[PDB]
Design a protein around this nucleic acid. Structure first.
Ligand SMILES: [Mg+2]
Ligand SMILES: [Mg+2]
Ligand SMILES: [Mg+2]
Ligand SMILES: [Mg+2]
Ligand SMILES: [Mg+2]
Ligand SMILES: [Mg+2]
Ligand SMILES: [Mg+2]
Ligand SMILES: [Mg+2]
Ligand SMILES: [Mg+2]
Ligand SMILES: [Mg+2]
Ligand SMILES: [Mg+2]
Ligand SMILES: [Mg+2]
Ligand SMILES: [Mg+2]
Ligand SMILES: [Mg+2]
Ligand SMILES: [Mg+2]
Ligand SMILES: [Mg+2]
Ligand SMILES: [Mg+2]
Ligand SMILES: [Mg+2]
Ligand SMILES: [Mg+2]
Ligand SMILES: [Mg+2]
Ligand SMILES: [Mg+2]
Ligand SMILES: [Mg+2]
Ligand SMILES: [Mg+2]
Ligand SMILES: [Mg+2]
Lengths: 206, 113, 152, 124, 243, 51
RNA sequence: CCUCCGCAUAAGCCUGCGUCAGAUUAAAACACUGAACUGACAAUUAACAGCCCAAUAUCUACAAUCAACCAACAAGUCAUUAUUACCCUCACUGUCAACCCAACACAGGCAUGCUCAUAAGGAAAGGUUAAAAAAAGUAAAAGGAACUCGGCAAAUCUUACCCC
RNA sequence: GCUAAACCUAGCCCCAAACCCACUCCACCUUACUACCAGACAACCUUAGCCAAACCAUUUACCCAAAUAAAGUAUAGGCGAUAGAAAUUGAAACCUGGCGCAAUAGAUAUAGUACCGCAAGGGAAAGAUGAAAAAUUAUAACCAAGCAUAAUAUAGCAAGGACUAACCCCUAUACCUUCUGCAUAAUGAAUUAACUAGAAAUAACUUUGCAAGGAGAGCCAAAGCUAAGACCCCCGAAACCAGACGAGCUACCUAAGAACAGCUAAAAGAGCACACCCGUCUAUGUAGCAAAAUAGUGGGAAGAUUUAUAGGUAGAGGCGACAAACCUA
């Protein structure tokens, strides 16, 4: 759950909590770290779910969507575009089923595209005076909303069903606390009918 | 395990409940007595010359006649100043080397990018 | 409760009562042979016999007759990569017994592997893999080594 | 040589060391002159377990519960919520006296009642 | 790396920190004064320039002190400006022999005095120079009150000085009623000093004792926040009502 | 006098994408064919225009 | 076949030949798989020895050695009284092992009880031939220390003389 | 081509600036990592020593207040190897790097980890493909010391002259050094890769610049003054002091315990003899089982005997039934 990562750990697509990650770089090799661009959290404009465009590569000028983002090394993948070829099932007597695998790209090679004309355009962070903070274009002045992407919880609230050990909503938001000058221990003692006649004598503290 | 996240969920729920009840107890103590941290104590210097927070153990007999509490010394004595100075110099070297590392990293970032 | 300073009791003071306890018992299945009345638990290092009796008779309300506990010392021989011993966390197992002569066994939480729902992001890949395995494994030793793709 | 990196448990000393070490168990009594233990019933932690019959609250919350902002519960909020209305009520009429404040919950000392806050007489 | 302040300024830094900075100004000045004592074990030079023989050229001469040792018996009793000299002495007063070590010890005479300001007799192992200074100062109280802290070289002397200063400042009844003329004459005899009360309590105290006294004066149990809260509440309601 | 051999790897591709992850695989084909076409038996005999 | 051994107590790191998968590589002086291993499963529950004793004043010279004759000298290993107060009671440490100290799985060393050989426990030999040399064991036609500075392993069983 | 060779980053040293920090709950002075009970005694002290003067007994910068000239001047000094001021003009606040390096270098450090002793303490190598290891692909190979591919073929410090061809023909006594004389049978060496050993003043030499003046205050000068270049090794002992540690093996002492079959028992610091304490001799090995072993021939074995537990006596000393014996091989 909470494992301490090495100070110079290499992020290679696979999450740190996996068998392939422990097989790749086990805690014994301290290879050369890869210095990445020091990008802050407020300037990160591209998210996960919006459409992007590959600048250059084996298939430049093509569109696609992002399914996973990496903030440690600025690695982003495209939904089945700049991909190669490998094999999934591999044994000692038979192997096949060639399934393409995506390749990560950098932020300098990925530009956000506006859905109005489907053209590459640099997007800046212009703080709106209404209250929220969205993304505003530069040469076009257009606004690009945040793409709706499912959270990591793996469950949507539009069809959630309360189980046996799941409470409702009308009881969790019921105002039942009464502010007073009584401790919880004495309150739960006097509420159950527990009484006490003797007191506590004098004691020192040193 | 079928669902290991339920354990962590219950753990964080109980931790939040403990934090809430501790905050309530601290607020009530400040409204009544007005002193933070229900564990009493004072800043005392040990033999090693380290400024630590000594916690009271709550005894029965007082301290002016106890046999085991009187054997617990609380004075620096002029022979630990050199060790404290050496520890300060070591920590200063650590901080200077950390600052040098940060400056080298900044220079590498400005040179490559 | 554990990791909590207990108040010093004076001769004639009030009853020491705890509300929100900080104990976590674990019902572990016995490894060796045990009778039908002896139940094995696992209490933390800061728990005695009367405390376990009160914890079992206050919450679960289980009639406990006798409690016999002992300390278990974890292993300490496993070496890492830099030649260093790995210390395992210790625990204290219990051996409580029922009072009214009742019986208790340890059921299994596992023999129920009858699950086959709709799988699109997991079962589809396995179905494609098994279909490819069934369609590809068709070698012919009479060919010698020529590929079976050219229809000529 | 013997071990040094390992901690001092209760399986290292001879016959004269097994006993006074222990595993940090809380004592509930003392000894006498006949190798006996005098257990006091007022020293064992008594677990107070309330009834759970008519209690309609599950340990897990539903996902349909709306979220809200988080803020610490300081002493000023509790004061302004509890003592402020009573003080305003007794002052708006004409009977407030700054000499006595024991009728609002304030205690000048902690040696009067049982459950003291600063010395903490209760366990947990 | 290097340090910002020298090694002989850390005491001043700690005094200017926080807990040691709340001390009064007169006490800090008396502690940082540091004045050389009077020559005891060596005859000081007359003028700053001395004409040495063999050559008719003037040269500047200086009187250096003698590193003497102060045992706790000196701090307990009332000694003069002497003590233990841990020096070295040659054989037959010649440098072409053997350099031996010799430690001189002062003479101790267990006598008995009588202080007029305190009206109580004390048994002090007095020496000879102290008796000579007492006879020259015309009494013991004058010798205690006139000599500064760098002349007593003892804690009992500073304690007696502080006690006499407090007795002369507070105007507390020394003896007893039914005869105030004696107390009036005693107070009039010692009138050329009269150190105020706020400055006489910090005379002769060490650093640790001064820190302890400052902590005891600045103790103050934490006032409950309920009083401050109700005070702010009543102030706010008065401000919103009177307007 | 206390060294062993490292390099512990396997030559087999197991399952690891869908084991606790939020990124699926965007394929570009399928397994086999949808329905097997059945040519006529007299295809070689009637290889002309029509009949 | 040996038992000049073993079982317990005392001292000692505490999990160190139970199961499962790997046994492709890695430590067995070679193999099976396991006293020179990786991860998971849990052993040992006290009644055994400890964890000890409310004070004020006072009291305790005729040993042990079957202790009954006798006999001593190194003159000795064990005990209570009056008063005050105290009727809550069974908590804690370990119960595994083929194990310790000597760099080791070493022909070295370790305190007491038990049958002084038994109901404890183990194998001098991997196979092939009988080279020379060396070490450990039985005896030999005649002499029994005649070889060696000296009775130097050895078995018979051995008296007298001198110095210290 | 196997063994195996290179792939840069944790950062490492000193400057300028800045003064740098220490409780989330529990445990930490007794057997620290221990919740709970009745003598409160615990610091205030010339450091020494090595070396040098060819020994050494006086002496020998180290002393913690910013530069320099005075000045290494008066002075102190077995008046000698050396040490060394003062009086005096004076001393321009603020700026983020390496004509240093990249794992045998640079802190020892990924670390004060393993390991050694009861103890203080000593204390070492580590990590290399790649944009995509969620690309287990097919390549990039080629160089040192060791090997097969591909053993020897008579003769000779391994070498030279040579011819149509390796030998066959002739000549020829390895390397640095203390030494007159060394391959000598004197010293060192198995190779490869990394590392390791001439650092500097007064007085001298040469070349610019200025000049009876030179020189960025101070110093020199009857052709001088300033600046630059040029120059003087490494490793290897027994000894002494200061601050801390050891009687768990061994010497002695203290308190409570245990051990000794059987026979003759003359009453015994009696005898033979089990277990036990020590080891006079033979044989085996001296990189062995063992940095002190294996059987008997051995002495004692009711006491000047042995042993389990706990404490004390430590170097200008402890102890000693006196071996200069022992004080953790
Ligand atoms: Mg057992
Ligand atoms: Mg050995
Ligand atoms: Mg058997
Ligand atoms: Mg053989
Ligand atoms: Mg014969
Ligand atoms: Mg002969
Ligand atoms: Mg013989
Ligand atoms: Mg010399
Ligand atoms: Mg000057
Ligand atoms: Mg290094
Ligand atoms: Mg190193
Ligand atoms: Mg080669
Ligand atoms: Mg020839
Ligand atoms: Mg050479
Ligand atoms: Mg030589
Ligand atoms: Mg010669
Ligand atoms: Mg030679
Ligand atoms: Mg020679
Ligand atoms: Mg040689
Ligand atoms: Mg001893
Ligand atoms: Mg002896
Ligand atoms: Mg005898
Ligand atoms: Mg005998
Ligand atoms: Mg002799």
């Amino acid at each position: 759950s909470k494992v301490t990562l090495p100070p110079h750990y290499r992020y290679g697509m696979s999450p740190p909590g996996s068998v392939a990650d422990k097989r790749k770089n086990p805690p014994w090799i301290r290879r050369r770290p890869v210095v990445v661009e020091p990008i802050s959290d407020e300037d990160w404009y591209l998210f996960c779910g919006d459409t992007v465009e590959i600048l250059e590569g084996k298939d430049a000028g093509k569109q696609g969507k992002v399914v996973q983002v990496i903030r440690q090394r600025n690695w982003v993948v495209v939904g089945g575009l700049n991909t190669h070829y490998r094999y999934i099932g591999k044994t000692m007597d038979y192997r096949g089923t060639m399934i393409p695998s995506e390749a990560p790209l950098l932020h300098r090679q990925v530009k956000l595209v506006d859905p109005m004309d489907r053209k590459p355009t640099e997007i800046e962070w212009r703080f709106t005076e209404a209250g929220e903070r969205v993304r505003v274009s530069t040469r076009s002045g257009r606004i690009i909303p945040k793409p709706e992407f499912p959270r990591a919880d793996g469950i949507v609230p539009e069809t959630w069903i309360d189980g046996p050990k799941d409470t409702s909503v009308e009881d969790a938001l019921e105002r039942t606390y009464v502010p007073c000058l009584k401790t919880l221990q004495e309150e739960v003692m006097e509420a159950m009918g527990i009484k006490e006649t003797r007191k506590y004598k004098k004691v020192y503290w040193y | 395990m079928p669902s290991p996240e339920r354990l962590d969920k219950v753990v964080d729920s109980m931790d939040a409940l403990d934090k809430v009840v501790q905050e309530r107890e601290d607020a009530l103590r400040l409204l009544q007595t007005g002193q933070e941290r229900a564990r009493p104590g004072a800043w005392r210097r040990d033999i090693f010359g380290r400024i630590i927070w000594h916690k009271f153990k709550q005894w029965v007999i007082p301290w002016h006649l106890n046999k085991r509490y009187n054997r617990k010394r609380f004075f620096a004595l002029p022979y630990v100043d050199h060790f404290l100075r050496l520890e300060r110099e070591k920590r200063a070297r650590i901080k200077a080397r950390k600052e040098n590392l940060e400056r080298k990293k900044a220079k590498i970032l400005l040179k490559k990018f | 409760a554990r990791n909590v300073v207990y108040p010093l009791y004076r001769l004639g003071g009030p009853q020491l009562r705890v509300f929100r306890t900080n104990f976590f018992i674990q019902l572990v299945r016995p490894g060796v042979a045990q009778p039908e009345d002896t139940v094995q638990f696992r209490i933390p290092m800061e728990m005695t016999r009367v405390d376990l009796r009160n914890y079992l008779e206050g919450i679960y309300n289980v009639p406990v007759a006798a409690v016999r506990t002992r300390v278990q010392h974890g292993s300490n021989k496993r070496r890492d990569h830099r030649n260093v011993r790995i210390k395992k966390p210790d625990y204290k197992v219990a051996y409580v017994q029922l009072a009214h002569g009742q019986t208790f066994t340890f059921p299994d939480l596992f023999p129920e592997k009858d699950e086959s729902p709709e799988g699109s992001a997991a079962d589809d890949l396995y179905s494609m893999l098994e279909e490819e395995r069934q369609q590809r494994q068709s070698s012919d030793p009479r060919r010698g080594g020529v590929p079976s793709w050219f229809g000529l | 040589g013997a071990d040094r990196m390992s901690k001092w448990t209760s399986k290292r000393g001879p016959r004269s060391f097994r006993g006074r070490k222990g595993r940090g168990a809380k004592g509930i009594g003392f000894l006498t002159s006949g190798w006996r233990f005098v257990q006091i019933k007022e020293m064992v932690p008594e677990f107070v377990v309330p009834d759970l019959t008519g209690f309609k609250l599950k340990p897990y919350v539903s996902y349909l519960a709306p979220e809200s902002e988080e803020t610490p519960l300081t002493a000023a909020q509790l004061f302004s919520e509890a003592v402020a209305p009573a003080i305003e009520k007794d002052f708006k009429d004409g009977t407030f006296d700054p000499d006595n404040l024991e009728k609002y919950g304030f205690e000048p000392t902690q040696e009067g009642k049982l459950f003291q806050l600063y010395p903490r007489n209760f366990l947990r | 790396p290097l340090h910002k302040y020298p090694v002989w300024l850390w005491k001043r830094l700690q005094l200017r920190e926080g807990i040691c900075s709340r001390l009064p100004g007169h006490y800090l000045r008396s502690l940082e004064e540091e004045r050389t004592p009077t020559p005891v074990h060596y005859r000081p030079h007359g003028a700053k320039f001395k004409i040495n023989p063999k050559n008719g050229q003037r040269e500047r001469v200086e009187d250096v002190p003698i590193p003497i040792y102060f045992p706790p018996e000196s701090q307990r009793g009332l000694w003069g400006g002497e003590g233990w000299i841990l020096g070295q002495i040659y054989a037959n007063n010649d440098k072409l022999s053997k350099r031996l070590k010799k430690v001189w010890k002062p003479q101790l005479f267990e006598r008995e005095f009588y202080s007029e300001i305190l009206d109580k007799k004390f048994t002090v192992t007095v020496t000879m120079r102290t008796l000579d200074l007492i006879d020259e100062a015309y009494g013991l109280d004058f010798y205690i009150l006139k000599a500064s802290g760098e002349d007593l070289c003892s804690k009992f002397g500073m304690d007696l000085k502080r006690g006499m200063l407090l007795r002369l400042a507070r105007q507390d009844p020394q003896l007893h009623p039914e005869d105030p003329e004696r107390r009036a004459a005693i107070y009039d005899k010692y009138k050329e000093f009269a150190i105020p009360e706020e400055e006489a309590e910090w005379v002769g105290l060490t650093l640790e004792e001064a820190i302890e006294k400052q902590r005891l004066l600045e103790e103050k149990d934490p006032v409950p926040l309920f009083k401050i809260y109700v005070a702010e509440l009543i102030q706010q309601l008065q401000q919103q009502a009177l307007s | 006098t206390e060294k062993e051999f490292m390099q512990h790897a396997r030559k087999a591709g197991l399952v690891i994408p869908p084991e606790k992850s939020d990124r699926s695989i965007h394929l570009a084909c399928t397994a086999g064919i949808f329905d097997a076409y059945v040519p006529p038996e007299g295809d070689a005999r009637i290889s002309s225009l029509s009949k």
